[PDB]
């Protein structure tokens, strides 16, 4: 049996640039204002959730540095022309920031002319807004911290763009990519703040420092080698053993 044990936490800030809405009262527009009320009902549910103030300690620390003034201005300006930026915070730590969605552009570019409409334009908006309806729906029930990191918290195409830029080894990027659903089950999404037209939540990916070492099951527990010593449930999959630091049916 091989191995894939966790040693640290990879912290990162995921942002979804929102857009301010002004006065909008003015058949095809019947469905526009209905998906518009869901966007209003979703952004207010995030702010009311924010009103309330030890496994993910390294991740939540960033969520309390974002509350500082001007820090949002650092991130909102970093993701000006692209969707991936690294910023040295007040603590001097450089965190990686990725702008997943750009609702700030889609609303001021396509809805200012009509409101202030083709039926084709209404279709795509319901999908871009539905993700916010779901991210809010998930953050509202798990009380700010969701796990595993779902598709809405970070899609399949966006978790890979993060693992590729992850300052880790080369083959482990090949390991985590083939076992993305396991990486998600060992991750944490942490809702942070809502202000200055930015929706940011801290995503915490697992760091696997121990790979391809012998391990054996069955004292009801697992045993994995680790620097000449052996440690102690672990999510197993095929020949790979995934675990972290604290009926042998079918046959193959």
């Amino acid at each position: 049996y091989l191995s894939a044990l966790r040693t640290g936490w990879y912290t990162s800030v995921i942002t979804i640039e929102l857009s301010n809405i002004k006065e909008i009262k003015c058949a095809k527009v019947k469905l526009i204002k209905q998906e518009l009320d869901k966007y209003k009902n979703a952004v207010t549910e995030l702010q009311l959730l924010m009103q309330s103030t030890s496994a993910i300690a390294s991740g939540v620390a960033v969520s309390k540095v974002l509350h500082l003034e001007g820090e949002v201005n650092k991130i909102k300006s970093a993701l000006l022309s692209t969707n991936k930026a690294v910023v040295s915070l007040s603590n001097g730590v450089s965190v990686l920031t990725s702008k997943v969605l750009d609702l700030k552009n889609y609303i001021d570019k396509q809805l200012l002319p009509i409101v202030n409409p083709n039926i084709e334009t209404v279709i795509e908006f319901q999908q871009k807004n539905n993700r916010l309806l779901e991210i809010t729906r998930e953050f509202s029930v798990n009380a700010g911290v969701t796990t595993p990191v779902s598709t809405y918290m970070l899609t399949n195409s966006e978790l890979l763009s993060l693992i590729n830029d992850m300052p880790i080894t080369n083959d482990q990027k090949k390991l985590m990519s083939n076992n993305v659903q396991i990486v998600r089950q060992q991750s944490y999404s942490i809702m942070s703040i809502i202000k200055e037209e930015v929706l940011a939540y801290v995503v915490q990916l697992p760091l696997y420092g121990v790979i391809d070492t012998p391990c054996w099951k069955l004292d009801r527990g697992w045993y994995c080698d680790n620097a000449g010593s052996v440690s102690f449930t672990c999510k197993v999959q095929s020949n790979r053993v995934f675990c972290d630091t604290m009926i042998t049916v079918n046959k193959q």
Partner: antibody
């Protein structure tokens, strides 16, 4: 299926820039995990990796050719452009491009390959 | 970096003879791959991930190995196997290939 084909000048005048373009179909580079690499082979010698690009515009070059290599993608055209400045009598090689995925670090699908000979 | 040493450099055997290529690396490498290049043609992926076999290739080819040593074993040689085989690593940058084993048929 996946297809690749190189395109460029077969004869180079020494030190003149060499623009090589690899068009691909059957897959979109914009899809996450996708990549496109470049491999050359001088006559009589073995293969040699050159560079590669990824969907997130992350670039990795070979330290053997540090200054001259410059790669760039083009999702809107399903092609990858590679510029090699200052060509030299030793750079005669059969240049190939290939697709790469983060799920498996190698080049599975290949192209026919173009011959570029470096001579006045 | 990671340098490759492929042996033998040139081997000759008859049709149906077991042939194994040994390709060692400098540092510890997780996965090893193999390629086949017919004369003039572009290479073709034979063995991927040390032991697994790629599609479009008969089960005649097999590989094994881990760490700093890897082998590619041909069960029974065939006249259509005349080519130059390489061992490629994708565990670290820069990407490096093997030395180059050119196999000839015994006739």
């Amino acid at each position: 299926q996946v297809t690749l084909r190189e395109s460029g000048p077969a004869l180079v005048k020494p030190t003149q820039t060499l623009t090589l373009t690899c068009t691909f179909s059957g897959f979109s580079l914009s899809t996450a995990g996708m990549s496109v690499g470049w491999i050359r082979q001088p006559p009589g010698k073995a293969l040699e990796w050159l560079a590669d690009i990824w969907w997130d515009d992350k670039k990795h070059y070979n330290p053997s050719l540090k200054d001259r290599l410059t790669i760039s993608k083009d999702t809107s055209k399903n092609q990858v452009v590679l510029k090699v400045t200052n060509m030299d009598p030793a750079d005669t090689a059969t240049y190939y491009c290939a697709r790469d995925m983060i799920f498996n670090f190698y080049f599975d699908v290949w192209g026919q390959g173009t011959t570029v000979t470096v001579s006045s | 970096d990671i340098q490759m040493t492929q042996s033998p450099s040139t081997l000759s055997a008859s049709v149906g003879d077991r042939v194994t290529i040994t390709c060692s690396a400098s540092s510890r490498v997780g996965y090893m791959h193999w390629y086949q290049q017919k004369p003039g043609k572009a290479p073709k992926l034979l063995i991927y991930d040390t032991s697994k076999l790629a599609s479009g290739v008969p089960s005649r080819f097999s590989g094994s190995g881990s760490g700093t040593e890897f082998t590619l074993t041909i069960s029974s040689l065939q006249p259509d196997d005349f080519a130059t085989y390489y061992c490629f690593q994708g565990s670290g940058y820069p990407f490096t290939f093997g030395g180059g084993t050119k196999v000839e048929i015994k006739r």
